[PDB]
Design a protein around this ligand. Sequence first.
Ligand SMILES: CC(C)=CCC/C(C)=C/CC/C(C)=C/CCN(C)CCOP(=O)(O)OP(=O)(O)O
Ligand SMILES: [Cl-]
Ligand SMILES: [Zn+2]
Lengths: 314, 346, 5
Amino acid sequence: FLSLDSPTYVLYRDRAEWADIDPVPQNDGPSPVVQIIYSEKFRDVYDYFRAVLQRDERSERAFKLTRDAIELNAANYTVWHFRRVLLRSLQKDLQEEMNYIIAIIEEQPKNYQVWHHRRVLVEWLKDPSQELEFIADILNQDAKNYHAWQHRQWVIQEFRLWDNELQYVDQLLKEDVRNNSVWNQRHFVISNTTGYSDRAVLEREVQYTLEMIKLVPHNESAWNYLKGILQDRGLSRYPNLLNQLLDLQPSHSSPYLIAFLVDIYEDMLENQCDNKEDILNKALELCEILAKEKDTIRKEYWRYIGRSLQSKHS
Amino acid sequence: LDFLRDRHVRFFQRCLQVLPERYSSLETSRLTIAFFALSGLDMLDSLDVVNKDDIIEWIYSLQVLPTEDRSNLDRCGFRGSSYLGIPFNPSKNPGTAHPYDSGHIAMTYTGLSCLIILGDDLSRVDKEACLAGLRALQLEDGSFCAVPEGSENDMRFVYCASCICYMLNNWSGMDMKKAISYIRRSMSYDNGLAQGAGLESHGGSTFCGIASLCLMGKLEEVFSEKELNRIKRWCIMRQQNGYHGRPNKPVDTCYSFWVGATLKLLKIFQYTNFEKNRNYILSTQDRLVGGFAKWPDSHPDALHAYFGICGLSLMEESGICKVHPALNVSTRTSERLRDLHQSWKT
Amino acid sequence: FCAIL
Ligand SMILES: CC(C)=CCC/C(C)=C/CC/C(C)=C/CCN(C)CCOP(=O)(O)OP(=O)(O)O
Ligand SMILES: [Cl-]
Ligand SMILES: [Zn+2]
């Protein structure tokens, strides 16, 4: 109702409807530590919030008071909890609350409490119909918002809404193939639907990734996905991969590719391959290429990796 | 350039004093701000510039003690501040019942942590109540919530639980088997650790996971050598100059600690490039007001000031104590804690 | 900024 910035705003201490309540002040003792200075308005709203909260008053005026407390500080988790208690006690229209939280989150998309509140509401309503679109909008202001992706995965999992996610992923990867969050989402969808054990799918994915890599060779995300879906099956178990990569090295080279190769060679050594002593040298040669010129910043790391391969296969 | 140590000491001093109304959103997390400042001063060996006794009383006034009837055990621990309006009581009298007064796992963590840093012996801490409250926060999947009334759950709180159990030197506060399960399940296909299963691996959650395991002394037992190598790879790939929290994301000073500390726990931080990291951290140093920011030419805050310093500490910056990479306190304080635990065992 | 809570 009465907005905090309205010319006709009135402190709660001056409101008739609140005459019967004694505001409860906050006290940090004799020597306050990390004390935050509050304006007259701010302290006023919260002094009354403490009062209402302290008496567990499930009133309509308390409900309206939380709106103000939240406008002053949406990070106050207690305020949100109490507001939820009230939503139930007063049997408020949850569809209305959805509009409220939708607006709040847009203004504060990195607040933990607001995302938690929305998730509770969606659980209550058992209605995920608005979620995917809402999240897509938030993801438009920040395609990597961890809260947004976390909420999106919860919704999809909880209400089994997998049908269109892989397509959504394909779209976002086109918008920015470097978005690590989207690559994670892709693995999320696939591993929760078809899985990767279906050789048809694995091939489709490995092929898809190589395509993205060819478009932007220097992208850790793409390389991590590629290695991710194959590392457990055994990188050395894919002879054509090793060669297809060696063929890229000329043009589409990057430290990610070299590292992949090193990892392939290491898998081979791990599986008593043919030419143990020769392979190990192919690896070491690359480790040094990484250290000396490809990924210099990790020079010591790569040398350390090399020395590890040395003392492990000789 | 160079490390303006004295400037940073004044910065933390100011934080312990007063904060601008623009920090109102940290009201319920004031205890963690106190931690950043106190542990920060500790790291700069300047705790002398504060009155340890006053602050210790303030901290104890934040402990949610069990009531006469002990019917609120599941809600004990520490509050982030006095925002509920409960009358100042430095853990002297028993608990005064209140419908919504409960502890917050991150506050119980930073609270105990602060007490130790200030030299207190935790005698006024109702260890059993805190542990009871902790247990109540754990979920079926092994992760934790921050408060008994309910909240989101993820790796952040698993780390808090671990730190609490470690400091109280009693792991009855959690079902370690389930927690470890949660930590394992959070490992991504790219080998980093995410906030939870299926989520994008992240430097913050990777630290929380690895540090938690180290605190339980089960790193080696939970992850195979092959697994640890993959995790190490993921972590060390985070260095661009400074460190970022996720692949293809811009570097942020605080990650010099989150990721750097993980690398230290994995014993390979030594293989990172110190100069570029140090240079980046310093580039975010506010030479005027002190402290550090997440990015250069950005405003500083307690969190980045503290983590930037701990980041520098990881590389043994001249003038900065060695930080315990898993407990997030100075080694000096971690040592004092070892003594405390020994003294109890008598 | 970084809200970690
Ligand atoms: C007080 C204290 C020392 C607590 C330790 C336990 C916790 C809460 C650790 C949190 C670690 C952490 C850095 C989590 C990530 C926080 N975010 C900023 C999440 C989502 O927002 P984004 O802006 O997408 O984050 P970013 O891009 O920085 O990864
Ligand atoms: Cl190291
Ligand atoms: Zn940061």
